[PDB]
Design a protein around this nucleic acid. Structure first.
Lengths: 185, 129, 262, 151, 149
RNA sequence: UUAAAGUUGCUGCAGUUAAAAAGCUCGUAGUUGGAUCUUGGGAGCGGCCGUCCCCUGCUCGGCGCCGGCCCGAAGCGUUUACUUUGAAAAAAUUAGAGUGUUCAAAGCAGGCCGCCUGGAUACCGCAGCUAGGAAUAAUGGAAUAGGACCGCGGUUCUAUUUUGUUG
């Protein structure tokens, strides 16, 4: 139904339940005027470290800002649809490998790993945009990036920083922290 | 104009080390500067530093400790072989018990002892002791 | 100059003759023959400094003019005839035969053989030729033209010929796994097994040869002489078997021999 | 277009005076082209097969053997007939001052008229052959276009 | 510092860190494209177009709200000028200086400034030749400067 | 003539006053040129980690498994510098293995009561060949799209395993 999987293979049961909840929600509500062409790409269910879980919902690139136009309502509708598990919106971006002399179109820099990871981090939280990134390198050589979020709309996304760190460690693979500074604004 | 960013970074680090400051602000960063600072971290000469990420070119704030004597950069990048490294050891280091030469090999930016261990050579970058 | 040279200096000589430095000015320049100038051994040098039968240059001439020296079943009276790789030296009076085989180092060696071994000769073929009336011809490394060979004989193969007749007996193909010898350069006289042959169009090809203990080296295609089918050589090998042990085990075995002998 | 000289230009492999069925049309007025492959992975282009020029110093349709060295250079001048000058750049190392100096020495190579879409500054591949003139010892095998030239 | 001046300047724009469209802006990229087309039909440079949009219409940059810059949009629509605007302004300034020197022959400083302006013109024209914006047979001269505006 | 000469300074000199910044500016050749493109783990050994396998593909085999898969190869991979290995690179001389010429400079001899030997090895600048690595520096992709892929429509010359034994 709502599943548009990029390869013609079998959608998962929890992803099918997500799509069924989305289609039932767009029938029972008035949002169907802005949900006729918007489609889910894929979904995943990971284990956030502790007693909580999270839902990752995959979004096509040219329909991203259509989901950002109504991102405020569907997160609380999926919170009241489920029990206590948080939900995020992450766009689906293809990652192209770095060319080598051992191995043709020129690879665009929007498909690079750094740009894809930065776009995933910026699209990870919508209501609070990033107003600064600091990278802490510890004495063992590992990287630990701390992310500053804006003062406006803080209490909506204050309790989700652990889930954001968990899903960013699962999708990307490096540790991230979040902070709300009080210096500028 | 600004032509060697790494030489400027190690010059500012050495100047603030001789002055006695505890934090150094390098305005332009590079990947080479990150690898050089990682080597200086792993051999225990500098402390725990940062990357100030803006959208043009990042800044680096280095927490200093009083273990650094001098940081220098050999310009230009002279190609050195494995039999020519000992010449640099005698005319660049103050002693044989300590002192390190950072050189750019194909296996990555590393010191001279790991370069002798992996049996490879490359281009010169600098030195610290 | 104005013509061909006729003299050879002692210091301006190939080192594998292994001459001294002060007993004369001139070297025995080998005569024109089947083999080249660098990779050959004259009868005067062999019979004077290897077998020690003669003392001066006149005495080896008096040996050679009594028709006692036989090369490939033929009596050669030349005092400076070039005897090259796998040339059979037969003495009828004393009664033994020799085969000129390289050892581990870059030199010739004295290697006695049985008379039944001294009736054939391994030789490398050089090029495939077609004669006047469509008759095939075969050119070996010692310049022995063979008429009517087998059609399966290719350029880089090797054949075994009969000395008293001059006909092809049997042949060994050049492929991976065959035991071979290196003839020339730094790798000289090493017995090994062929494992690879890289192809370079327009230049000299290079092969990869593996030793009997896991060691490997590489030579050109022109410095390859196949001596056997698989891992079995067709001739008798000298002592050491062309292994090229380096200087440390040579020092250790010399110390062990000096300890066991005293 | 052909035979602008005092002597007739012909290929000395093809016999063009063979008897025909009618000495007219429908099976005539098409000379059989002679060409060969020079080896070393160099493909014979189609215009040398489909062309009408008759040259003795052409690497493909001529009596010239290619062996020895294969070099490269950039095209400098196109003034004299069927022979161009290429430029080669290298780095010369000095033992005393641990640095480099860069020199150039240009050489003249013979241009077959098979390659017509050639300009100044193109990467060219040359191969050694027999001496065709006083200062010419190389022939053009392939042409690589310069930076840009999208139209 | 400068190229033909001993002074040193530190007067340039400083973009903010945030590259996101603000929530108070109510202009979709097609509307600002239409406004750019209207201002280009009024005969304005892309720099003046950016000045007018930033001052009146409240946008920060076109590039932060649209995936192309102003000159890229004008080249995609096909009404950009055939000559770059900075080189055109330099030619106009050189024409004005030469017109001043047609009647005043005692002004050595203006001749020095004319030499500096022509050196800057040739330096920019070499870069525009290497970037294949200008044809290779283009050349700045005196009589060529009078026919061109 | 060499070292002393850090008094020719590439390593490694000086230019306010001791010898020495062109009166100033523009400017071609030359030299030098900002940041940025693939990160982290898995299967493990011992007490987080010095070692070990992994993060390029589409016509014949044989090296295996059930015509198919797999591996190996005809054929190929944007080009360079740099770095490591291999080939070839005359001898003498240089370093250096062995050896009581009475020692040594030398020499390639010699020692056991017919036999055993040795007559090594390294270096050989640059340029030329070859095989692994992509950190460092320069070059090119697609912007007026004839952009990369995918399957459908035609213009020319030709392959005998196939239109009863014959034009």
């Amino acid at each position: 139904a709502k599943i548009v999987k990029p390869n013609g293979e079998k959608p998962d049961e929890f992803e099918s339940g997500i799509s069924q909840a989305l289609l039932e929600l767009e029938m029972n509500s008035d949002l169907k005027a802005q949900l006729r062409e918007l489609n889910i790409t894929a979904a995943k269910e990971i284990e956030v470290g502790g007693g909580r879980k999270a839902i990752i919902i995959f979004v096509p690139v040219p329909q991203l800002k259509s989901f950002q136009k109504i991102q405020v309502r569907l997160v609380r509708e999926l919170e009241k649809k489920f029990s206590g598990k948080h939900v995020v919106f992450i766009a689906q971006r293809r990652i192209l490998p770095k060319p080598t002399r051992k191995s043709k179109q020129k690879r665009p820099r929007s498909r690079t790993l750094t740009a894809v990871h930065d776009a995933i981090l910026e699209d990870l939280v919508f209501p609070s945009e990033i107003v600064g990134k600091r990278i802490r390198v510890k004495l063992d050589g590992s990287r630990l990036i701390k992310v500053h979020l804006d003062k406006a709309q803080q209490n909506n996304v204050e309790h989700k920083v652990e889930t954001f760190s968990g899903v960013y460690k699962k999708l990307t693979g490096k540790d991230v922290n979040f902070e709300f500074p009080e210096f500028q604004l | 104009v600004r032509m060697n960013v790494l030489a400027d970074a190690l010059k500012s680090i050495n100047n603030a080390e001789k002055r006695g400051k505890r934090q150094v602000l390098i305005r332009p960063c590079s990947k080479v500067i990150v690898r050089f600072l990682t080597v200086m971290m792993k051999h225990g000469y500098i402390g725990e530093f940062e990357i100030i990420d803006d959208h043009r070119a990042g800044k680096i704030v280095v927490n200093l400790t009083g273990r650094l004597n001098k940081c220098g950069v050999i310009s230009p990048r002279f190609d050195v072989q494995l039999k020519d490294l000992e010449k640099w050891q005698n005319n660049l280091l103050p002693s044989r018990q300590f002192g390190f030469i950072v050189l750019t090999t194909s296996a990555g930016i590393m010191d001279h002892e790991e370069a002798r261990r992996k049996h490879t050579g490359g281009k010169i970058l600098g030195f610290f002791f | 100059a104005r013509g061909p040279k006729k003299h050879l200096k002692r210091v301006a000589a190939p080192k594998h003759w292994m001459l001294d430095k002060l007993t004369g000015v001139f070297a025995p320049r080998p005569s024109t023959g089947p083999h080249k100038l660098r990779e050959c051994l004259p009868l005067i040098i062999f019979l004077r400094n290897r077998l020690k039968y003669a003392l001066t240059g006149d005495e080896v001439k008096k040996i050679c003019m009594q028709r006692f020296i036989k090369i490939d079943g033929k009596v050669r009276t030349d005092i400076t005839y070039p005897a090259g790789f796998m040339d059979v030296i037969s003495i009828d009076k004393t009664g033994e035969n020799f085969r000129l085989i390289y050892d581990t180092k870059g030199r010739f060696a004295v290697h006695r053989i049985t008379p039944e071994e001294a009736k054939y000769k391994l030789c490398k073929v050089r090029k495939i030729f077609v004669g006047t009336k469509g008759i095939p011809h075969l050119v070996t490394h010692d310049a022995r033209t063979i008429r009517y060979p087998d059609p399966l004989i290719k350029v880089n193969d090797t054949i075994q010929i009969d000395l008293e007749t001059g006909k092809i007996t049997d042949f060994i193909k050049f492929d991976t796994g065959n035991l071979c010898m290196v003839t020339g350069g730094a790798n000289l006289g090493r017995i090994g097994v062929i494992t690879n042959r890289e192809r370079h169009p327009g230049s000299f090809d290079v092969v990869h040869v593996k030793d009997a203990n896991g060691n490997s080296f590489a030579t050109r295609l022109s410095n390859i002489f196949v001596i056997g089918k698989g891992n079995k050589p067709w001739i008798s090998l000298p002592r050491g078997k062309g292994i090229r042990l380096t200087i440390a085990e040579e020092r250790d075995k010399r110390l062990a021999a000096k300890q066991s002998s005293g | 277009d052909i035979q602008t000289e005092r002597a007739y230009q012909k290929q000395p492999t093809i016999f063009q005076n063979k008897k025909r069925v009618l000495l007219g049309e429908t099976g005539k007025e098409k000379l059989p082209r002679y060409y060969k492959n020079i080896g070393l992975g160099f493909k014979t282009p189609k215009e040398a097969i489909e062309g009408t020029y008759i040259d003795k110093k052409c690497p493909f349709t001529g009596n010239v053997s290619i062996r020895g060295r294969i070099l490269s250079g950039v095209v400098t001048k196109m003034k004299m007939q069927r022979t161009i000058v290429i430029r080669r750049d290298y780095l010369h190392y000095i033992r005393k001052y641990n640095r480099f100096e860069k020199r150039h020495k240009n050489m003249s190579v013979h241009l077959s008229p098979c390659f017509r879409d050639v300009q100044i500054g193109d990467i060219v591949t040359v191969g050694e052959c027999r001496p065709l003139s006083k200062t010419v010892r190389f022939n053009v095998l392939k042409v690589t276009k310069a930076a840009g030239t999208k139209k | 510092g400068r190229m033909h001046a001993p002074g040193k300047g530190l007067s340039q724009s400083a973009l903010p860190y945030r590259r996101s469209v603000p929530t108070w802006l109510k202009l979709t990229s097609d509307d600002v494209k239409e406004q750019i087309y209207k201002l280009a039909k009024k005969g304005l440079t892309p720099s003046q177009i950016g000045v007018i949009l930033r001052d009146s219409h409240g946008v920060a940059q076109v590039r932060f709200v649209t995936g192309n810059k102003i000159l890229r949009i004008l080249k995609s629509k096909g009404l950009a000028p055939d000559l770059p605007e900075d080189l055109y302004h330099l030619i106009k300034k050189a024409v004005a200086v030469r017109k001043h020197l047609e009647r005043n022959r005692k002004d050595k400083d203006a001749k020095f400034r004319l030499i500096l302006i022509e050196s800057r013109i040739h330096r920019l024209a070499r870069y525009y030749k290497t970037k294949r914006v200008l044809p290779p047979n283009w050349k700045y001269e005196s009589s060529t400067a009078s026919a061109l505006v």
